[PDB]
Amino acid sequence: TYTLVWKVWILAVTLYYAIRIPLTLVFPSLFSPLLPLDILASLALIADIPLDLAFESRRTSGRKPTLLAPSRLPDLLAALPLDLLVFALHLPSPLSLLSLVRLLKLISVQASATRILSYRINPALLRLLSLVGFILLAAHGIACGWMSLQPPSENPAGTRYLSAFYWTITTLTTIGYGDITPSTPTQTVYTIVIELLGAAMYGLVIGNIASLVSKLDAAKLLHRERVERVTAFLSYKRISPELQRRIIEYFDYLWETRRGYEEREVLKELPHPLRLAVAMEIHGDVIEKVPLFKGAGEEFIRDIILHLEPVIYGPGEYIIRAGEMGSDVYFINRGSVEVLSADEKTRYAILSEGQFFGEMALILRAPRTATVRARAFCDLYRLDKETFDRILSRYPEIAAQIQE
Amino acid sequence: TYTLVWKVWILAVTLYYAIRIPLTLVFPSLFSPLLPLDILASLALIADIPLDLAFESRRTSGRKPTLLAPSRLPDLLAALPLDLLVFALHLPSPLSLLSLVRLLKLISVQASATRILSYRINPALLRLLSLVGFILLAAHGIACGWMSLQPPSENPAGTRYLSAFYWTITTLTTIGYGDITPSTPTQTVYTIVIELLGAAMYGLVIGNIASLVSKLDAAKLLHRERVERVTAFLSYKRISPELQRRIIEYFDYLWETRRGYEEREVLKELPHPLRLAVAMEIHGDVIEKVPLFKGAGEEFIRDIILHLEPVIYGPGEYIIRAGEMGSDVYFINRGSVEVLSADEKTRYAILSEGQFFGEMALILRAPRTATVRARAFCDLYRLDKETFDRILSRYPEIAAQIQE
Amino acid sequence: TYTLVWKVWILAVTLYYAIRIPLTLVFPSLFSPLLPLDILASLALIADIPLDLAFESRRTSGRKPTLLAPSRLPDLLAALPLDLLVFALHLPSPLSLLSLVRLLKLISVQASATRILSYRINPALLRLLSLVGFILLAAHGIACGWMSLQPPSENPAGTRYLSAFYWTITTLTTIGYGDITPSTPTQTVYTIVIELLGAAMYGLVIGNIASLVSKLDAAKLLHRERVERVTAFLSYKRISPELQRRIIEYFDYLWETRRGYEEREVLKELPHPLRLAVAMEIHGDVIEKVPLFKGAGEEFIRDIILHLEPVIYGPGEYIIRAGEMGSDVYFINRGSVEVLSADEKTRYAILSEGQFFGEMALILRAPRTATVRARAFCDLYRLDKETFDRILSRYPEIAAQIQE
Amino acid sequence: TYTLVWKVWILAVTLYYAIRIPLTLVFPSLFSPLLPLDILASLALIADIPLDLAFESRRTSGRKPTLLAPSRLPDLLAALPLDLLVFALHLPSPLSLLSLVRLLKLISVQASATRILSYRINPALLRLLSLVGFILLAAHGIACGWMSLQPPSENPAGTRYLSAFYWTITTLTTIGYGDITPSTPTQTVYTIVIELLGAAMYGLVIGNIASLVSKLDAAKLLHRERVERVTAFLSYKRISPELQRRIIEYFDYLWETRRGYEEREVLKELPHPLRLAVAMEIHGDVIEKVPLFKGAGEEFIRDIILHLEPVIYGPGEYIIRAGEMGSDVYFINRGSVEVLSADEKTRYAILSEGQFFGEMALILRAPRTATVRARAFCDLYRLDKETFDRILSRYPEIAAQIQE
Ligand SMILES: Nc1ncnc2c1ncn2[C@@H]1O[C@@H]2COP(=O)(O)O[C@H]2[C@H]1O
Ligand SMILES: Nc1ncnc2c1ncn2[C@@H]1O[C@@H]2COP(=O)(O)O[C@H]2[C@H]1O
């Protein structure tokens, strides 16, 4: 995309400006050798004036009140080539400090980088990364200020920049070795305000990290606290340790399969067409694999499909017993069950991976002809008899059909 | 408002007192030149005694137990002109330390500033701002204490105040360069307690910042974790990547339109009259634009209106197909649909921006005469047939009407 | 209570031990003058062995497995008078370091102080207070260790204790001036481990403060984010600014009255008898103030009472209009309404503070005889006609009564 | 388990490598004496190449794309014996820095330790422990780097290692005494990057601690905020202080018994078979202790069992009064009730620990023959008459039975 590469170029240009403008403010001799870049950057600095208005016009233009509002005002203020003229005129420090207006583009750059990276990047991590980048740029600018308040000396420019950056990293990280310290009162005022800013931004870093790690394992923490709540309630209820262990291993299966998410709660997040499609292709060819739903309209299939209730049967659990009066049918999704007798010694069948059981109770109220026992965790779907008749009432033709 | 400007004046007076009272405690020669201000401030310091009781009387007076309770007791304690008399008498330091009772008005000032700014300002940000202001005032007071425990010298007052403020900012920000350090045991005790206080208040700043940034993007984080939960569940269910992409782009549309908020959940927050008005002017002239709801009572219109179910149909999704038995009507809110044949090759019509489809199924149970396909995201509202008859039962006159 | 004062005495004794045992470990000459206290404390140190087992026996004794388990094991280990014998024998430092076993009672003291103060004190604030007290005791112990690793000198004991406490407060608060620093390798190892411990406990303080302030305004933050969600949804729905302002002021009223809590959600937290009593005395003599519910059984009154639905009508809102078919009755709780004509020019009546309207629709289906308009926020309760007949079905005698 | 002990051995080997590789990088003379260990470790470093692929094959093998993907790539990169060859060749520092590739196994070790300890250990605490271990290893490596940038001297290796570790603990904990400080520009660059890393990881520690303590008392905080919400709502409703105290003590009982968890909300977390088993053995032999449910099928017992509604009756509360028409039966779970007359002076009976009352209303609509008053908190279960007939409709045989 041309918009993405243009935004990357604008970000690189603004990073170059943030690095250079204080650096050339304290080193005016650096202004001339990098003059061919600046004008190009300055061209970009005005080339982004319409293009941004163009790039927001393609994405739901609506209203674009430029030259006003909290948005696009710092962009236009930084867009004007103040830096070139002030560095050409070689104005004194109180007036040449206005060259930092060029750095006001950084807030718009951060907003644009948020907009182009709010999808594949966590907003907490994106905010932390933007804060860290702004902190590095601010550390460079603060080191440049420390240059500008250092006494003049014949120290090499690299060595004194290293010392200034070392001081501002000691200050900003709240470490403060104190080997290099303020000497003049103006340096002391500057160190006070830089200390306040560094404490503020280090608290910002710590808070952003705390926010990032507070929901780093939100699903696992939610599932574990649900398990703890259930276990505490059962221990209060004097539940036998065998059933507690069965519930614990069920929750372990739930966590290891679907991250402990309840299927019903996840499905209500979807709208009706998306829920319909999800539940149709969850039971894709599975629901129309049974005979009673054959030769039926796809509308009646979907009326079954939205009314299927998921239910997890742990290993060794009776789904339906023989002689039970029975009021439901079950469609195995990914588990496995065994159909046995009422005595559960002779295994009639083994059903897994999309087959079903209990359809006799769907067309008569006679008790179950056989017992169904869960071999392992089943993840099968239960359709109630009463819901089946409730949806059968408004399809009369298949209501007449299912007598056969 | 007179109350707001009076509270601003009281806040300014208390800030002046917080700046000056320790400053004139360590500089008694400052007491005389600022005497005309103090009495005026002292007048304000008693002028706020009834007016606050007046200003809380206008806002649900109820009970106003002054001269007692945790509220209004520090206000009255700071209201008395202790500072003027103690600075006039020039009492020694252990007894003149009681002039800080004037600064006890700061808690009431913070409470009042909270009350007048709990609407347009986030409570976390308001608490952080109050904490930062109190930290600056405490830093000034601690620097004044550092003056009061420094050995006497002919150093200029400004320079030594700068040194003291520099020390207390090193201490409070937990930086601690150590260039200036305790020398006397009393200074060491003072530095210990100031270090504990500064660590406490810096932890307060970091905690407030962490709280502020933990819910800085609460809507985006909630929507993203909902999307992650749905995507993880679908990937467990072996959902095809085409449907996963469709659900992802649906959630992107939901986030970019209504911040990922489910319409039903938002509407249950409103009470019945406000929900009625919201759903009436959401479908403003839209619901009475259809023929079957014409010449009807506005009560029956509102009975439709509260029972409309929102539903989002993604682009290329079938709302209703031709030959489907059909049990609902749809009112397009802001999307666009196309009415096509059962073969979906001949386009019958294009419907968008407030028009509707599917009204035949509202007065007969015959199948749909045409297929409706979503051009883009629809945001339309679905009214069920069964709900329509449920509300039609108790309006017999329009029940007789709608046969035509 | 004897238990509370005994626990306070035990806490004071353990604080005395935590202050003294390292202090007398580095100052053996302090052991003899405070000998009469120690034995008394030692007596308390064994007097708490049965009494705690007694004090937990009064509060649901159940099982009390002493001399084992993570509970009551540190209590018994600290209970034995190791300190007295080791300070009597004057054993060398590696063996006399075992006198700190007496300080193991601090975890049991913290647990007991939690149990006796988990009701009127926030658990986050209680945890933070316990952490701060333990940090102060640990700072004293660490300063004593710093004494024990300082080179011997004729410095006064108070001055060197002040220096040691100053060092451990610099270390624990992560300030670190560096004016006093390790000199010997053993001091350097000690400073490394103390730095790790101080960073750990300062992170603990910051985390506890962050937890405390994350839910310091949980109700206000929840209400404000609900308001923001509703407002964002309505702005997406192009809701008119008049209705948005009405909803905003409704939410302001809700926050200023019931802290933004929905009445239904609060009532479901209560069990059936408590909900019954709450809703009975909310409408105390209010529900039996109307004529149709006179001479009725209190059981039928309570069947009305649990089925009353609260609803807030904002000022200037129509509750019921004249000519509306009407299916409910309303009991004003604390608001005020005006009964006017269909034209709403002639005011029939003003109803407030426990009276009612709309009872004709409770015994006939004829339309409303007059319009009811909300003067201000009403907080009235709505009883539906269908619910009224649903509960009237199983009281036949008053079903026969209400025809009159 | 062989897998667990092999993972422990791998963790120990990688900890040995993390301790030694920088230590022998700055002390080449240490490479030869520990050569027999390294090769053994190197053997383990390749012995984990198939075994991990084996150990993930036993646990739902599925796909194992080794030699690629973000997983198993650092494991294989660290698996190759780069360290042995580079320390044998004695290559210079820029090329011998590649021996740290062996330390890339630490991320896989952390992941494996997470997987083997995500069950009995809190994920927040596990993350914090892994972070602290990685911080200690990084502190050792950073101290080794500080050695490598220190000027050469005849200082003892232990003493200078102690000084380097002291410096990196001052830096990483953001304490920064400044007694030992950078001297050379390369040391200053190293200190800058180490300061940034130490601030980052100390913010990580503080954030992890904040996350750990934000949900350290999640149940207690949730219950307390629910109690505060209910109390604030009732105080708004002018609820009498007697009923407020009764609700407060009910919530205290709820917290002290089931941690304030609502029974219904906990039960919906369970699936249908687990909920069936839980509610069956909660009423184990309790539900079939009553006469009307005798000689009945176990299916009808379970149909009762899933439809039992828990309800807490506080002490002195009327469950059912004599003369009340009555529409439910109650099964006492662990509380105690007294059956008295309508005048409640003559005590008919005392029922507790699994017995029941109110069964007459289960087979007739005549009013209650006696009043039932709660002696203490009851925790009994309520079965409605309407639900009883609703489940009785589809068992005709016991529907005929219960007339007797
Ligand atoms: N021999 C069999 N082969 C396959 N399925 C069977 C067999 N016997 C029983 N079943 C299934 O097991 C179910 C048990 O309950 P139903 O008798 O309701 O319906 C039964 C059939 O779905
Ligand atoms: N020619 C048309 N012009 C406008 N709307 C149409 C036309 N044909 C069909 N429709 C609408 O498309 C709907 C499809 O479902 P129904 O047949 O229930 O009701 C149909 C009408 O609402």
Ligand SMILES: Nc1ncnc2c1ncn2[C@@H]1O[C@@H]2COP(=O)(O)O[C@H]2[C@H]1O
């Ligand atoms: N004159 C009146 N005095 C008191 N209440 C009235 C009067 N006229 C009407 N109302 C009440 O206002 C209500 C409006 O709706 P209804 O007619 O259903 O029932 C009406 C009465 O409860």
Ligand SMILES: Nc1ncnc2c1ncn2[C@@H]1O[C@@H]2COP(=O)(O)O[C@H]2[C@H]1O
């Ligand atoms: N004498 C008694 N012994 C035991 N239980 C009784 C006695 N009298 C009443 N009850 C129980 O108390 C209940 C009160 O309500 P019911 O009359 O519906 O049903 C009653 C019986 O369950």
